[PDB]
């Protein structure tokens, strides 16, 4: 009957999931930019390619 007198175990986990999802959502953006998963970020690759450009002409 929509009373949390016996749903305490489920209610706390719902709060725990909300905090767990909140923590991951508010930290993924900053670290993923420089984490690079082993592959250089787009800014570094652009500079690397500019040093060895492609030559369509001549």
């Amino acid at each position: 009957e929509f009373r949390d007198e016996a749903c305490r175990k489920e209610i706390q986990d719902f709060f725990d999931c909300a905090s767990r999802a909140e923590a991951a959502r508010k930290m993924r953006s900053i670290q993923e930019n420089l984490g690079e998963l082993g592959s250089l970020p787009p800014k570094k690759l652009n500079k690397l390619l500019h040093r060895f450009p492609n030559k369509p002409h001549v």
């Binding site: 060895f52 450009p53 492609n54 030559k55 369509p56 002409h57 001549v58």
Partner: protein, 99 residues
């Protein structure tokens, strides 16, 4: 006066043949914290990393042993009239020179 053609015949580079899998000794001329710029007598300078064993004795002017794979790294990509060189060479470390 020795003709230029005779010089190429007896030059060590010509006697080497193909550059793949050749044991060539070289001398280090520049040191970074982890990169060793090695000159092996070829046109360019190969780059190798300091080994974890006896790493403290790899200093400027030290002679090491190399296994040349490509004399000059160079490849062709589509849309490129001319190949894009890397201005380096590919080699691996087999140890330090046994004086």
């Amino acid at each position: 006066v020795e003709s230029f053609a005779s010089m190429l015949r007896h030059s060590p580079l010509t006697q080497m043949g193909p550059a793949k899998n050749k044991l060539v000794i070289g001398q280090i001329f520049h040191i970074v914290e982890d990169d060793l710029y090695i000159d092996f007598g070829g046109k360019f300078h190969c780059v190798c990393k300091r080994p974890e064993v006896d790493g403290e004795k790899y200093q400027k002017g030290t002679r090491v042993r190399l296994r040349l794979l490509d004399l000059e790294l160079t490849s062709r990509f589509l849309g490129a009239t001319t190949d894009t060189t890397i201005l380096e060479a590919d080699a691996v470390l087999l140890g330090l020179q046994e004086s």
